[PDB]
Amino acid sequence: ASLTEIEHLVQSVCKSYRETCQLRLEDLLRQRSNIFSREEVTGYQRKSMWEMWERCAHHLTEAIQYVVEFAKRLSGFMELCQNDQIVLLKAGAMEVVLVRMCRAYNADNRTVFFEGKYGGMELFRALGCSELISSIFDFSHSLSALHFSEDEIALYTALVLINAHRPGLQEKRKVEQLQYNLELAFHHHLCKTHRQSILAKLPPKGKLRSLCSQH
Numbered sequence: 537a538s539l540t541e542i543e544h545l546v547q548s549v550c551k552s553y554r555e556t557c558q559l560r561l562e563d564l565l566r567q568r569s570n571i572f573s574r575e576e577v578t579g580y581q582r583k584s585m586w587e588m589w590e591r592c593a594h595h596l597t598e599a600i601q602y603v604v605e606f607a608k609r610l611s612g613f614m615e616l617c618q619n620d621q622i623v624l625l626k627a628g629a630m631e632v633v634l635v636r637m638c639r640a641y642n643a644d645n646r647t648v649f650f651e652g653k654y655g656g657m658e659l660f661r662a663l664g665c666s667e668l669i670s671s672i673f674d675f676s677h678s679l680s681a682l683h684f685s686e687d688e689i690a691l692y693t694a695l696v697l698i699n700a701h702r703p704g705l706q707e708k709r710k711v712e713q714l715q716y717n718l719e720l721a722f723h724h725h726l727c728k729t730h731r732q733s734i735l736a737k738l739p740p741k742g743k744l745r746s747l748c749s750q751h
């Protein structure tokens with residue numbers, strides 16, 4: 537696969553992300569001004585831990601379906617076997633969702649887009665796990681600092697999915713070949729856009745996955 541082929545991979549990964557991104561960036565930014573009042577916040581705080589888990593679970597499961605579409609529309613993905621497709625999505629879909637969420641995080645006021653408005657982490661008080669929530673907020677904060685472009689997120693989240701170190705792969709070599717082609721594609725596109733500096737600022741390998749040890 538020469539460099540003109542790798543350039544099709546970039547444009548293809550970026551198209552799939554644009555089609556499957558669930559919420560437009562423009563809308564998330566437009567909506568940053570629309571914030572939950574103290575009354576509305578209290579309203580969420582009063583809800584049962586069960587109600588809030590069912591809400592968050594619904595929304596996160598919805599987000600997971602878009603990550604499944606994203607993966608389906610990657611050429612290279614569908615050429616993998618039935619088993620490995622499941623292993624990869626099992627291991628990474630939620631990592632991908634978390635990464636995607638930074639787009640819905642506003643670092644000026646430490647709020648996240650939830651049910652039509654922006655709110656802080658106190659919105660989720662009824663879950664009874666503010667350590668988990670604070671560390672998710674810090675994680676979005678640190679990605680927010682990078683000012684990830686849409687195409688950067690596209691390419692990074694593909695690399696989150698396509699990871700040949702996942703336990704239980706039957707065609708390890710095949711997933712490696714895909715992984716290395718996406719690593720190159722990412723690097724090449726960063727070079728085209730003079731954004732090589734973001735590579736050193738990316739999260740460590742498995743700091744993303746260690747955030748799903750509590751989860």
Ligand SMILES: COc1ccc([C@H](C(=O)Nc2ccc([Si](C)(C)C)cc2)N(C)C(=O)c2cc(=O)[nH]o2)cc1
Pocket residue numbers: 557558559592595596599633636637640648649650651652660669672
């Ligand atoms: C792919 O990126 C996404 C960005 C925002 C949303 C939000 C949401 O889900 N935000 C959200 C959930 C969970 C925690 Si958490 C408990 C991990 C800190 C934070 C924040 N969203 C669309 C909705 O909340 C929503 C309201 C509605 O009526 N239907 O869906 C989903 C996906």
